[PDB]
Design a protein that fits this description.
This is part of a larger assembly, with 10 protein chains of 7 kinds.
Chain B lengths: L11 H6 L24 H9 L1
Chain E lengths: L4 H4 E3 L6 E3 L2 H14 L1 H4 L14 H6 L7 H9 L31 H18 L11
Helix pairs in contact in E: 2-6, 5-6
Chain F lengths: L20 E3 L5 E3 L18 E2 L2 E2 L1 H6 L3 H11 L5 E2 L19
Antiparallel strand pairs in F: 1-2, 3-4
The chains are: A mainly alpha (334), B mainly alpha (51), D mainly alpha (176), E mainly alpha (137), F alpha+beta (102), G mainly beta (243), H mainly alpha (97).
Bound molecules: digalactosyl diacyl glycerol (dgdg) (DGD), chlorophyll A (3 copies), ligand PL9 (2 copies), 1,2-distearoyl-monogalactosyl-diglyceride (2 copies), 1,2-dipalmitoyl-phosphatidyl-glycerole (2 copies), heme C and 3 more.
One copy of the ligand CC(C)=CCC/C(C)=C/CC/C(C)=C/CC/C(C)=C/CC/C(C)=C/CC/C(C)=C/CC/C(C)=C/CC/C(C)=C/CC/C(C)=C/CC1=CC(=O)C(C)=C(C)C1=O sits at the interface of chains D and A.
PDB class: metal binding protein
Keywords: Photosystem II core complex, Mn cluster, water oxidation
Entry title: cryoEM structure of Photosystem II averaged across S2-S3 states at 1.71 Angstrom resolution
Chain lengths: 334, 51, 153, 176, 137, 102, 243, 97, 51, 51
C-alpha cells in the first residue's frame, strides 16, 4: 500500500486503544491546546481587565485564588467580539492583560468538542452500531455553545461569556437572572424538569433493575459478580420489575418494553437540556422571562404585590450592584 | 544586598553558572534592564525539564 | 456587665459560619469590658435609636429613628443626595455606665463608628491581639452541638 | 415562591458557595448525564431482532436474551472516552447511587443553613481585600451582588421587621 | 379602596378651580398615556432626562405651572424647558410638532385633557411610586 | 449634558476613561461607557459626526441636528429588550410598555 | 485624503499628523494679531518609570516599561489661546480637548503602573522675543494631574469617596486603625511639567511639529499607596491660526 | 487624620443649601425658574467669592437678576472641592433615579 | 465576660451540668475561691474515663 | 556596599545550624543598607578596634 493508504488505514483503525478517526485528527490538537493553555492560565495568569475599565480581576492560583475562586477570566470588554489571537498583541504582557487566553481556550475547546461529537458518530459507523449517541451528546454541547459563543455574540462581547471557573460561573448565573429573569423563562423551567427528571429516572431505573437482580451469588459476595461480561442471558427479571412498578402506581404507568424504557430515559433529559440551551441562546437576543411586575392591581389602582414582585426586588439588588464602575448612563442595554 | 544566595536559592545559581540569566518577566540576575533572553530563560529551562 | 453582654449579637449562635473554626473569642476577640450604654441624639436633643442587625444579615446599614420609628439619621451610601447624614443632623453619642460612663462624643467619625457597633447591641471592648482574632463572628457550643446532632440524626 | 426561596438563599446564605450544595449539583447533573447516556447507548447497541425499521416491536418482556450488545457498547465507550462499564449490575447500582447521594449531601447543607451555619466567606480573601483595594476576584464580586440582594429585597420580603431603608442607604453602583 | 370621584377630582386651572374626571376619562387617559408617552415616561420618570419627572410637586414648580389640566394641555401643545425660557417642540412630542411625532397627529382636546388627568390622578393613587423610579418598584 | 454646559471631550469618568468619549484599541475616537464594545456600529444618524480619526469633537460641539437628537432618543427607548409576554425594557421594568423588538 | 474607512483598524488614528522633511522655515508673529492653537496632538512613544532602590543612597533612574493598554494613548483635538506677551514670548493656555488618557505600563517583574497621561489646564510659554516660530523654539509649561479614578469609583469591597461603604463590612469586629488608609478614600491633584521642542515649521500653513517630554506622577489608588514618577517622551503636532 | 472630604463637606452649608461653587446642576430644579438657563450660567461662571457675586454674571437680564435675588437665600458658597468638581461631575454626577 | 461558651468548650459544660464545677488547680467555673471539689474535679473525671 | 556586605559574618557559610531552616534572610533579616564604617575612639582620641 502507498504511504497515504497506510496512514488512512491507521487513522481509521478500530484497533487503536483510543479511536482517532478523521474528526479526531482535528479534536486531538485542539483539545490539547485548550487544555494546556487552561491549566497554565488557571495556575499562573496575571489579572485580566474583563470589563475594559482598567480594573483587572485576578483569576489564577498564584495571584491569590483558591480552587473555588479561581478562573480564566473572559477577554476585555474593550475587545468586544474582535478576534484577539496572540499575534494580534504587541506582546504577551498585553495579551495577558487583555485576556487573550480565554479566547484561545474557548475557541479551541468549542472546535474540539464539535469534533468529539463527530467522532462519536464516526466510531459508531466503524463498529456497526446505530448512530445517535452523538445526538444525545448534542445537548450538553449546545449548552456549551450557548454560554461561550452565542450569548457573547448576542450581547456584543466575549467579556459576557461564562468565566472558566466555579465562582465565575456563579457570577454569570446571578447577573443572568438580574438581566433576563431566567427563572421565569419557560425554557429554563423545561431545563429544570429535564435535569430533575433525569436524576429521578436515573434513580428509578437503577433501583428497579437492582431490585430485580436474579440470585446468582451468596450473601458474602457482591451481587455484581452474578453478571459475567458478555453473557447472553439477561441479569434481572424485567417482568418482576414491571409487576412491582405497575402495582406501585398502576399497571399502565409502567414500561414492560425495555427498548421503550431506554428510549424514554434518553429522551427526557436530552430534550429538556436542548430547551434550556435554547433558553440561554434566545435570551442572548434579549427575549427574557415572563414579567408580571405589578400585574395585580386593586379597585383604586393600588399595586398588590405577588411573589413575582418579590423576585423583582431581588433582581433589582443584583442589577444595581453588578459591575459597579462600568455604567455611565441610566439603562443597561447590553 | 539581596542576591540569590541570601534567599535560599539552590538551582538558580546552577542555571546562572552556564549562561541562563534572564526571566520572561523581564529581569536579569545581574540587575540589567530591557534584556530579552529568548526561550532559554529560567522559565523556559523549567518547562523544558518538565516536558 | 453579664446582662449587658448577653444583649450582644456576637453571642447569638446564629451568626457563625461552617468553616469559621474555633472559639467565639477567635472572632470578635476576648471581651474585656462593657463600654456603657450609648445614647444617640440629634442637634435638636431628641434621642435616636440604632436599628439592630437581624441574625439573617451578614452586613446591615446604620439607620437611626426616633421613638415613633421615624428615620432621623443614617450613614448614606451615595452622598450626593444625602439628607440624613450624621453631619447634617448633628448626631452626638453619650455613654452611661461602663468604661465610657459620662463621656460625650461629637466628632462625626467617632459617632459613626459607635453607631456601627450599636447595630450589634451593647458595645464592648475586646482584646483582639492575644488570639490574632480576625473580627468575623463564630457560633457557640450550642450551635455546633445542634448542627452535629441534627446531621447525625 | 420557590424561585424567591432560591434567590433568598443566594443573597443571605451564599448557598452556591456551599460544598454540600455543590455535591448535590454534581449528583443531579451526573444523574441526568447517566440517564441520557445509558438510554442512548442501549438504543444504539440494540440487536436486530425483527425486520421493522421501528425497533421497539422487536422486544418481548418474557425473552431471556439481552436486547443490546454489552460487548459492543463497552468497546465503543472504551475507545471514545477511555473507560467504559463492563458489569451491568454495577452500572445500574451506580445509577441508583449518584442522584441519591447528591440529594443527601444537599440536605446536609440545608441542615447547616437552618442555623445560619453558612459557607459564606473565605477569610483569607477577605483579609487581603480589606487591606488591598486593587485585589478583586469573582468571589468578591458575588459578595457585592449578595449585599445588593439583601438591601433591596428585605423590606418587602420580611414585612414583620418594619424595615425602612432611606434611598440614600441603598447600595448601588454608578448610574444604576 | 375604590376609584372615587374625590380621587378623580383634580385642579383645572391656576386659580384653584377643580374638575371631576369620569372613570372612563381616567381609563382613556391611561391608555393614551401608554400609547404616546410611556416609552419615555413609564411610571412618571423621564428616561431620556431623569432629572425631570412628572410628580405633581415638580409640575407645580415648573414655569409656567404644570400642576393643572390646562397647564398640561398647553405643555402638550407647546412644550418648554423647565424655566419656560425655551420652546422644545423640535425635540419633544406635541401638536405643533405632530409632523415629526406622528403619534400626536390624531390627538384631540378631550384626549389631551384625559392624558393630563391621568398624570394628575396617578400620584394620588400610587404615592411615591409615581416618578420614584426603580427604588419604589 | 453638553447642552447643560459639560465639556464632553474632557469629561473624566469614574474609572479614568472618558465619560462620553474614549479611544478604541486601535485609537479611533468612540463613545464611552459599556457601549465601547459597540464601536463598530455604523448608522446614518451617527455617521455625520465621524471623521478620519473617528467621532469628531468639533462636529459634536457644533453640528448635532435636532433630527439626530430625536432619532437617538427614539432608538435608546426602543432598544431590543423585552419579556416573553411583551413587556418592553429590562427585566426589572414594571408593566406599562407593550413592546418586543422584531 | 484618508477617510475613516481607510483608517479604521490600522492604528493610524492614534498617531499625530507629521510634516515632511522640507518643512524647515519660519512662521511670522505680528505681536498685534490674536492667535489660537486649533489642534494640538501629543503622541507618546516611550513611558519611563523611576525605580525605587529601597536604599536612599544611590540615584534612582528612569527605566523602560511595556505598554499593555494598546493604541489608546494619544492626546488630540486640543485647542486654546496663544497670547503674545510683552517680552515677545508666546503663551499657550489650553481650554478644552481630549487632554487625558488612562495608560497602564508594565515594569520588569510584572508590576503594573497605571497613570492618567494628561495635559489638563496646560499653560506653556516660549523664550522671550519670539517674533517668529522657528525650529529653535520651545514651550515649557505646567499642567494639572487629577486623581486617576474620580469620586464615584468603588473598590472591590464597595468602598468609595462620594459613594460606597466607609468600613470593611466583611470584618465587622476588626480593629479599624490599621485599615484607615484603605477605608478612607482621598482625591489627589498634583502638578506635571512638559517641554515641547519644535523641529519642523511650515510657514505657509502655520503647522508646527516636534518632540515632547513630560513628567508627572502615576495613579495612587485614591491614596491607598504612593505614586511613581513617570516620564513620557513622544512627538507632537500643532496647528496655529490667526484669529 | 485621614478624612472623607465629601462627608466633611456635608457638615458645612453645602449640606443645607445649594453651594454655587460645588453642587451638581440638577439641584437647581428645587426652586422655580433656575433650571436650565440660570443653572448653566451659574455653573459655568463659578467659583464665586460671595453669594451676591452671582448677580454680576455678564449678560443677565433684569428678570434673571430678579429671580436670582429672590432665590439668594437658598444659595451658599464654600471653597471649591476638587472631588466634587472634577470629572465634569457638576454636570453629571452619575445619579439618575 | 469570658465564660466557657466563649472559649469553644464542648465537654466542660456537660460536666458542669451534672455537678462537676471545681478544678484540682483550685478554681471553680462559678468564680468562687477556696473551694475543694475532692476527687471528682474536671481532672478526676478525665482520669476516670481514661482508666 | 557589595564589598562591605561581603565583609560581614552573617554571610559566612560556617555560621549556620542543621535545623535552622530556610534562607539566610530568615535569620538576620533582609539586608537594606550599609550603615557605614564604625570607628571607635576612647577619651584620648586614639582609634580602637573591635575584635
Ligand atoms: C404550548 C406552547 C404554546 C402554547 C400557546 C400558549 C399561548 C396561547 C396564545 C397566547 C399568545 O401567544 O398570546 C400572545 C399573542 C396574543 O397576545 C397579544 O400579544 C401581543 C404581544 O405583543 C406584540 O404586540 C404588541 C402590540 O402590538 C407589541 O407590538 C409588541 O411589541 C409585540 O410583541 C400583545 O401583548 C397583545 O396585547 C396580546 O393580545 O399571540 C401571539 O402572538 C401568537 C404567537 C404564535 C406565533 C408564535 C410566536 C413566535 C415565537 C417566536 C419565538 C420562538 C422562539 C422563542 C421561544 C421562547
Ligand atoms: C458532636 C461533635 C462535636 C461538636 C459539636 C464539637 C464542637 C466543638 N469543638 Mg470539638 N471535637 C470533636 C467533636 C465535636 N466537637 C471530636 C470528635 C474531636 C476529635 C477530633 C474534637 C476535637 C476538637 C479540637 C481539637 C478543638 C475542638 C473545638 C471545638 C469547637 C469548634 C468546632 C469547630 O470549629 O468546628 C469546625 C467544623 C467544621 C469545619 C466542619 C467539618 C465538616 C466536614 C469536614 C465535612 C465532611 C464531609 C464528607 C467528607 C463528605 C462525604 C462524601 C460522601 C460522598 C460520603 C466546638 C465547641 C475547638 C475549640 O475551640 O476547642 C476549645 C478545638 O480546638 N474540637
Ligand atoms: C446547575 C444548577 C443547579 C442544580 C442542578 C441544583 C440542584 C439542586 N438544588 Mg440548587 N440552586 C442553584 C443551582 C442549582 N441547584 C442556584 C444557582 C441557587 C441559588 C442559591 C440554588 C438554590 C437552591 C436552594 C435554596 C435549594 C436548592 C436545592 C437543590 C436540590 C433539589 C433537590 C430536589 O429535587 O428537590 C425537589 C424536592 C423534593 C425531592 C422533595 C420531595 C418532592 C415530592 C416527592 C414531590 C411529590 C409531588 C406530588 C406527586 C404531586 C405534585 C403535583 C403538583 C405539582 C400539582 C438539588 C441538589 C434544595 C436543597 O438542597 O435541598 C436539600 C434547596 O432547598 N437549590
Ligand atoms: C542536594 C540536596 C539539596 C540541597 C543542598 C538543598 C538546599 C536548600 N534548599 Mg532544597 N530541596 C531539595 C534538595 C536540596 N535542597 C529537594 C530534594 C527538595 C524537595 C523535597 C527540596 C525542597 C525545598 C524547599 C521547598 C525549600 C528548599 C530550601 C532550601 C534551602 C534551605 C535548606 C534547609 O533549610 O535545609 C534543612 C535541612 C535539614 C533540616 C536536614 C534534614 C535532615 C534529615 C531529616 C535527617 C534524616 C535522618 C534519617 C531519617 C535517619 C535514618 C536512620 C537510620 C537507621 C537509617 C537550601 C538552599 C528552602 C529555601 O530557602 O528555598 C528558597 C525551601 O523553602 N528546598
Ligand atoms: C489546574 C487546576 C488545579 C485545575 C482544576 C480546575 C478545577 C476547577 C477543578 C475542580 C473541578 C472539580 C472536579 C470539582 C467538582 C467537585 C465536586 C462537586 C465533586 C462531587 C463529589 C461527590 C461525592 C458528589 C456526590 C454525588 C456523586 C456521587 C456524583 C458522581 C458524579 C459522576 C461521577 C457521574 C458519572 C459521570 C460519567 C461521565 C459517567 C460515565 C459513565 C460511562 C462511562 C458510561 C458509558 C456506558 C453507558 C452504557 O449505557 C453502557 C451499557 C456502557 C457499557 C458504557 O460504557
Ligand atoms: C383515613 C382514610 C379514609 C383512609 C382510607 C384510604 C383508602 C383505603 C382509600 C382507598 C383507595 C382510594 C379511594 C383512593 C384514593 C383516591 C385518590 C386519588 C387519592 C390519592 C391521590 C393522590 C393524592 C395521589 C396521586 C398522585 C400520584 C401518586 C401519582 C403519581 C403519578 C406519576 C407522575 C408517576 C410517574 C409515572 C412514570 C411513567 C414514571 C416513569 C419512571 C421510570 C422511568 C421508571 C423506570 C422503569 C420502569 C419500569 O416499568 C420497569 C419495568 C423498569 C425496569 C424501570 O426501570
Ligand atoms: C484517622 C485520622 C482522622 C483525621 C484524618 C482526617 C483529617 C481531618 C480532616 C477533616 C478536617 C476537618 C476540617 C476542620 C478545619 C480545621 O482546621 O478545624 C480546626 C478546628 C479547631 O479550630 C481551631 O481552634 C483553635 C482554638 O483551639 C484556633 O482558634 C484555630 O484558629 C481554629 O482553627 O477543629 C475542630 O473544630 C475539630 C472538631 C470539629 C467538630 C465539628 C462538629 C461537627 C461535625 C459534623 C460534621 C458531620 C458532617 C458529615 C457530613 C457527611
Ligand atoms: C514521600 C513523602 C516524602 C515526605 C515524607 C517525609 C516528610 C519529610 C520529613 C523530613 C522533614 C525534613 C525536616 C526539615 C524541617 C523543615 O521544616 O524544613 C523546611 C525547609 C524549608 O525551610 C523553610 O523555608 C521557608 C522559606 O521558603 C521559611 O524560611 C521557613 O521558615 C523555613 O522553615 O525545607 C527544606 O529545606 C527542604 C529541603 C532540605 C534539603 C537539605 C539538604 C540536606 C539533605 C541531606 C540529608 C541527608 C541525611 C541523611 C542521613 C541518613
Ligand atoms: C421540538 C423538538 C424536540 C423533539 C425532538 C425529538 C425528541 C426525541 C429525540 C431524542 C434523541 C435522544 C437520543 C437518541 C435516542 C435514540 O437512539 O432513539 C432511537 C429511537 C428508536 O429508533 P428506531 O430506529 O426504532 O426509530 C427511529 C427511526 O429509525 C424510525 O423507525 O428513535 C425514536 O424512537 C424516534 C422517535 C421519534 C418520535 C417522533 C418524533 C419526535 C416527536 C416527539 C418530540 C416531542 C417534543 C416535545
Ligand atoms: C479523548 C478522550 C480522552 C479522555 C481523557 C480522560 C478521561 C478520564 C476518565 C476518568 C478516568 C478515571 C476513571 C476512574 C474510575 C474507573 O476506572 O472506572 C472504571 C469503571 C469500570 O467499571 P466496570 O463495570 O468495569 O466495573 C464495575 C465492577 O467491576 C467493580 O466492582 O467505570 C465506571 O465505573 C464508570 C463510572 C465511573 C465514571 C467516572 C468518571 C469520572 C469523570 C471525571 C471526574 C473528575 C474530573 C476531575 C477533574 C479535576
Ligand atoms: C421621549 C422621546 C419622550 C416622550 C415620548 C415624551 N416625553 Fe415628556 N419629556 C421628555 C424629556 C426629555 C423632557 C424634559 C425636556 C426638558 O428639557 O425640559 C420631558 C418633559 C415633560 C414634561 C415636563 C416635566 C416637568 O416639568 O417636570 C411633561 C409634562 C411631559 N414631558 C409630558 C409628556 C407627555 C404628555 C407625553 C406624551 C404625549 C410625553 N411627555 C412624551 C421626553 C419624552
Ligand atoms: O459586561 Mn458583563 O453584564 Ca451584559 O448587561 Mn451591560 O454588559 Mn455588563 O452591564 Mn449588565
Ligand atoms: Cl458583577
Ligand atoms: Cl454605560
Ligand atoms: Fe438499563
Amino acid at each position: 500500500a502507498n504511504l497515504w493508504e497506510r496512514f488512512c488505514n491507521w487513522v481509521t483503525s478500530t484497533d487503536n486503544r483510543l479511536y482517532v478517526g478523521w474528526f479526531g485528527v482535528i479534536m486531538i490538537p485542539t483539545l490539547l491546546a485548550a487544555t494546556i493553555c487552561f491549566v497554565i492560565a488557571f495556575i499562573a495568569a496575571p489579572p485580566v481587565d474583563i470589563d475594559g475599565i482598567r480594573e483587572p480581576v485576578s483569576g489564577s492560583l498564584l495571584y491569590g485564588n483558591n480552587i473555588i475562586t479561581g478562573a480564566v477570566v473572559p477577554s476585555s470588554n474593550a475587545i468586544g467580539l474582535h478576534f484577539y489571537p496572540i499575534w494580534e498583541a504587541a506582546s504577551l504582557d498585553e495579551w495577558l492583560y487583555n485576556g487573550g487566553p480565554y479566547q484561545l481556550i474557548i475557541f479551541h475547546f468549542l472546535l474540539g468538542a464539535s469534533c468529539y461529537m463527530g467522532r462519536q458518530w464516526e466510531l459508531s459507523y466503524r463498529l456497526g452500531m446505530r448512530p445517535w449517541i452523538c445526538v444525545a451528546y448534542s445537548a450538553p454541547l449546545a449548552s456549551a455553545f450557548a454560554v461561550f459563543l452565542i450569548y457573547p455574540i448576542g450581547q456584543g462581547s466575549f467579556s459576557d461569556g461564562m468565566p472558566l471557573g466555579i465562582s465565575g460561573t456563579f457570577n454569570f448565573m446571578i447577573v443572568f437572572q438580574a438581566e433576563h429573569n431566567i427563572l421565569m423563562h419557560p425554557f429554563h423551567q423545561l431545563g429544570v424538569a429535564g435535569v430533575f427528571g433525569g436524576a429521578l429516572f436515573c434513580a428509578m431505573h437503577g433501583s428497579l433493575v437492582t431490585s430485580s437482580l436474579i440470585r446468582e451469588t451468596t450473601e458474602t459476595e457482591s451481587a455484581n459478580y452474578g453478571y459475567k461480561f458478555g453473557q447472553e442471558e439477561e441479569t434481572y427479571n424485567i417482568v418482576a420489575a414491571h409487576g412491582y412498578f405497575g402495582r406501585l402506581i398502576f399497571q399502565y404507568a409502567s414500561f414492560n418494553n425495555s427498548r421503550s424504557l431506554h428510549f424514554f430515559l434518553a429522551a427526557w433529559p436530552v430534550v429538556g437540556v436542548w430547551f434550556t440551551a435554547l433558553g440561554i441562546s434566545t435570551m442572548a437576543f434579549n427575549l427574557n422571562g415572563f414579567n408580571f411586575n405589578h400585574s395585580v392591581i386593586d379597585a383604586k389602582g393600588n399595586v398588590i404585590n405577588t411573589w413575582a414582585d418579590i423576585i423583582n426586588r431581588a433582581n433589582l439588588g443584583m442589577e444595581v450592584m453588578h459591575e459597579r464602575n462600568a455604567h455611565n448612563f441610566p439603562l443597561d442595554l447590553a | 544586598l539581596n542576591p540569590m544566595w541570601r534567599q535560599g536559592m539552590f538551582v538558580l545559581p546552577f542555571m546562572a553558572r552556564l549562561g541562563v540569566t534572564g526571566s520572561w518577566s523581564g529581569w536579569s540576575i545581574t540587575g540589567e534592564t530591557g534584556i530579552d533572553p529568548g526561550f532559554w530563560s529560567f522559565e523556559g529551562v523549567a518547562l523544558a525539564h518538565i516536558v | 456587665e453579664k446582662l449587658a453582654f448577653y444583649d450582644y449579637i456576637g453571642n447569638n449562635p446564629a451568626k457563625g459560619g461552617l468553616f469559621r473554626t474555633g472559639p467565639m473569642n477567635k472572632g470578635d476577640g476576648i471581651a474585656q469590658a462593657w463600654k456603657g450604654h450609648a445614647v444617640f441624639r440629634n442637634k435638636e436633643g431628641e434621642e435616636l435609636f440604632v436599628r439592630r442587625m437581624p441574625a439573617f444579615f451578614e452586613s446591615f446599614p446604620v439607620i437611626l429613628t426616633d421613638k415613633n420609628g421615624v428615620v432621623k439619621a443614617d450613614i448614606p451610601f451615595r452622598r450626593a443626595e444625602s439628607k440624613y447624614s450624621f453631619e447634617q443632623q448633628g448626631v452626638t453619642v453619650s455613654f452611661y455606665g461602663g468604661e465610657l460612663n459620662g463621656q460625650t462624643f461629637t466628632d462625626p467619625p467617632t459617632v459613626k463608628s459607635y453607631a456601627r457597633k450599636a447595630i450589634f447591641g451593647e458595645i464592648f471592648e475586646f482584646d483582639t491581639e492575644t488570639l490574632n482574632s480576625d473580627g468575623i463572628f463564630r457560633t457557640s457550643p450550642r450551635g455546633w452541638f445542634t448542627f452535629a446532632h441534627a446531621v447525625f440524626a | 415562591a420557590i424561585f424567591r426561596f432560591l434567590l433568598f438563599f443566594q443573597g443571605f446564605h451564599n448557598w452556591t458557595l456551599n460544598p454540600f450544595h455543590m455535591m448535590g449539583v454534581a449528583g443531579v447533573l451526573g444523574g441526568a448525564l447517566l440517564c441520557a447516556i445509558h438510554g442512548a447507548t442501549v438504543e444504539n447497541t440494540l440487536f436486530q431482532d425483527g425486520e421493522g425499521a421501528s425497533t421497539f416491536r422487536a422486544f418481548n418482556p418474557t425473552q431471556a436474551e439481552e436486547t443490546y450488545s454489552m460487548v459492543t457498547a463497552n468497546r465503543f465507550w472504551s475507545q471514545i472516552f477511555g473507560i467504559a462499564f463492563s458489569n451491568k449490575r454495577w452500572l445500574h447500582f451506580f445509577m441508583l447511587f449518584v442522584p441519591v447521594t447528591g440529594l443527601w449531601m444537599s440536605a446536609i447543607g440545608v441542615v447547616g443553613l437552618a442555623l445560619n451555619l453558612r459557607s459564606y466567606d473565605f477569610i483569607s480573601q477577605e483579609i487581603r481585600a480589606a487591606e488591598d483595594p486593587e485585589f478583586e476576584t469573582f468571589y468578591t464580586k458575588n459578595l457585592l451582588l449578595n449585599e445588593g440582594i439583601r438591601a433591596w429585597m428585605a423590606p418587602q420580603d420580611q414585612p414583620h421587621e418594619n424595615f425602612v431603608f432611606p434611598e440614600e442607604v441603598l447600595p448601588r453602583g454608578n448610574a444604576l | 379602596a375604590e376609584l372615587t370621584p374625590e380621587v378623580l377630582t383634580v385642579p383645572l386651572n391656576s386659580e384653584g378651580k377643580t374638575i371631576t374626571l369620569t372613570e372612563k376619562q381616567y381609563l382613556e387617559g391611561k391608555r393614551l398615556f401608554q400609547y404616546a408617552c410611556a416609552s419615555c415616561h413609564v411610571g412618571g420618570i423621564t428616561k431620556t432626562n431623569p432629572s425631570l419627572d412628572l410628580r405633581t410637586e415638580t409640575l407645580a414648580l415648573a414655569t409656567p405651572p404644570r400642576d393643572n389640566i390646562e397647564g398640561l394641555v398647553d405643555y402638550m401643545k407647546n412644550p418648554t424647558t423647565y424655566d419656560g425660557e425655551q420652546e422644545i417642540a423640535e425635540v419633544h412630542p406635541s401638536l405643533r410638532s405632530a409632523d415629526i411625532f406622528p403619534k400626536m397627529r390624531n390627538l384631540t382636546e378631550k384626549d389631551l385633557v384625559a392624558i393630563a388627568g391621568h398624570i394628575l390622578v396617578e400620584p394620588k393613587i400610587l404615592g411615591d411610586k409615581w416618578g420614584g423610579g426603580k427604588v419604589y418598584y | 449634558d453638553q447642552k447643560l454646559g459639560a465639556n464632553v471631550g474632557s469629561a473624566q469618568g469614574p474609572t479614568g476613561l472618558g465619560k462620553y468619549l474614549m479611544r478604541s484599541p486601535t485609537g479611533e475616537i468612540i463613545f464611552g461607557g459599556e457601549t465601547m464594545r459597540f464601536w463598530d456600529f455604523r448608522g446614518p444618524w451617527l455617521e455625520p459626526l465621524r471623521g478620519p480619526n473617528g467621532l469628531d469633537l468639533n462636529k459634536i460641539k457644533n453640528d448635532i441636528q435636532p433630527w439626530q437628537e430625536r432619532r437617538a432618543a427614539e432608538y435608546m427607548t426602543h432598544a431590543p429588550l423585552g419579556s416573553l409576554n411583551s413587556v418592553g425594557g429590562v427585566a426589572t421594568e414594571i408593566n406599562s410598555v407593550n413592546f418586543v423588538s422584531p | 485624503t484618508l477617510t475613516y474607512d481607510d483608517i479604521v483598524g490600522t492604528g493610524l488614528a492614534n498617531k499625530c499628523p507629521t510634516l515632511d522633511d522640507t518643512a524647515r522655515g519660519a512662521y511670522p508673529i505680528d505681536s498685534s494679531q490674536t492667535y489660537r492653537i486649533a489642534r494640538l496632538c501629543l503622541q507618546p512613544t516611550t513611558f519611563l518609570v523611576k525605580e525605587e532602590p529601597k536604599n536612599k543612597r544611590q540615584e534612582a533612574e528612569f527605566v523602560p516599561t511595556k505598554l499593555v493598554t494598546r493604541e489608546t494613548t494619544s492626546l488630540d483635538q486640543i485647542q486654546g489661546e496663544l497670547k503674545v506677551n510683552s517680552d515677545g514670548s508666546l503663551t499657550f493656555v489650553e481650554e478644552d480637548g481630549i487632554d487625558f488618557q488612562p495608560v497602564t505600563v508594565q515594569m520588569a517583574g510584572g508590576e503594573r503602573i497605571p497613570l492618567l497621561f494628561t495635559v489638563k489646564n496646560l499653560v506653556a510659554s516660549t523664550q522671550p522675543n519670539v517674533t517668529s516660530i522657528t525650529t529653535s523654539t520651545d514651550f515649557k509649561g505646567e499642567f494639572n494631574v487629577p486623581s486617576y479614578r474620580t469620586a464615584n469609583f468603588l473598590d472591590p469591597k464597595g468602598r468609595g469617596l462620594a459613594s460606597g461603604y466607609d468600613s470593611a463590612i466583611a470584618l465587622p469586629q476588626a480593629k479599624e486603625e490599621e485599615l484607615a488608609r484603605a477605608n478612607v478614600k482621598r482625591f489627589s491633584l498634583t502638578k506635571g511639567q512638559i517641554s515641547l521642542n519644535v523641529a519642523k515649521v511650515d510657514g505657509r500653513t502655520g503647522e508646527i511639529a516636534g518632540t515632547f517630554e513630560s513628567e508627572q506622577l502615576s495613579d495612587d489608588d485614591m491614596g491607598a499607596h504612593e505614586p511613581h514618577e513617570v516620564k513620557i517622551q513622544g512627538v507632537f503636532y500643532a496647528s496655529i491660526e490667526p484669529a | 487624620e485621614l478624612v472623607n472630604v465629601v462627608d466633611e463637606k456635608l457638615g458645612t452649608a453645602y449640606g443645607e443649601k445649594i453651594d454655587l461653587n460645588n453642587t451638581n446642576i440638577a439641584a437647581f430644579i428645587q426652586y422655580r425658574g433656575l433650571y436650565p438657563t440660570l443653572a448653566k450660567l451659574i455653573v459655568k461662571n463659578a467659583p464665586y467669592e460671595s453669594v451676591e457675586d452671582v448677580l454680576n454674571i455678564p449678560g443677565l437680564t433684569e428678570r434673571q437678576k430678579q429671580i436670582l435675588r429672590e432665590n439668594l437665600e437658598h444659595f451658599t458658597v464654600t471653597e471649591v472641592e476638587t472631588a466634587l468638581v472634577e470629572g465634569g461631575d457638576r454636570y453629571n454626577n452619575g445619579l439618575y433615579k
